[PDB]
């Protein structure tokens, strides 16, 4: 069903939907691992389905339609605690590469494409444990796609060889983010 921001479990899967209150976004939980997002001149939002808690070796499958009209990205997104880390494995994006401004650490090959690895620090930003300071890790896919399989272990291992030691995994979802743009997406996670 179409819901206001929140989290929970729907049809077997954890979901998380958040927006900045701007308006212009409609998030709908669908059958099984499916979710749909339709936005028009939105603000900033992030929504998707997955697991809570996630794991360090989950192989995530996703398929569907991703039609961004401007600034937006499709990614595996999650958090870790001890250390507190917010991470993204970006599979596709619209007009803006979300890793812009981040520091490149290296590259990793996974699931048919090379990914560029980045990191950036966030000071006194909102997090799953409140206002805190933490790193953001990014794996950005060179060959964009809207369907496929992501072997998370390849990314966590690569990040570990670059100094990132993940601790306790919190949620882990396939999410669609929009940033003051328009678009539509219908993604199914499994």
Swiss-Prot record:
Pathway: Glycan degradation; xylan degradation. Glycans are attached at residues 38, 61. Substrate binds at residues 73, 77, 88, 122, 126, 136, 171. The keyword Glycoprotein applies. Its EC number is 3.2.1.8. GO terms for biological process: xylan catabolic process. This is Endo-1,4-beta-xylanase 2. The lineage of its organism: Eukaryota, Fungi, Dikarya, Ascomycota, Pezizomycotina. The gene is xyn2. The chain holds residues 35 to 223 of 223 of the full protein.
């Amino acid at each position: 069903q179409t819901i206001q921001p929140g989290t929970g479990y729907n049809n077997g899967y954890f979901y998380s939907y958040w927006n900045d209150g701007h308006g212009g976004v409609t998030y709908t939980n669908g059958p099984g691992g499916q979710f749909s997002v339709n936005w028009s001149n939105s603000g900033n939002f992030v929504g998707g389905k997955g697991w809570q808690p996630g794991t360090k070796n989950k192989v995530i499958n996703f398929s569907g339609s991703y039609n961004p009209n401007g600034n937006s990205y499709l990614s595996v997104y999650g958090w870790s605690r001890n250390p507190l880390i917010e991470y993204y494995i970006v599979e596709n994006f619209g007009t803006y590469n979300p890793s812009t401004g981040a520091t490149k650490l290296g590259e990793v090959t996974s699931d048919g494409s090379v990914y560029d690895i980045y990191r950036t620090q966030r000071v006194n930003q909102p997090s799953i444990i409140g206002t805190a300071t933490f790193y953001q890790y990014w794996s950005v896919r060179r060959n964009h796609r809207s369907s496929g399989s992501v072997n998370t272990a390849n990314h966590f291992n690569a990040w570990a060889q670059q100094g990132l030691t993940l601790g306790t995994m919190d949620y882990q979802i396939v999410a669609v983010e929009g940033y003051f743009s328009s678009g539509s997406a219908s993604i199914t996670v499994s």
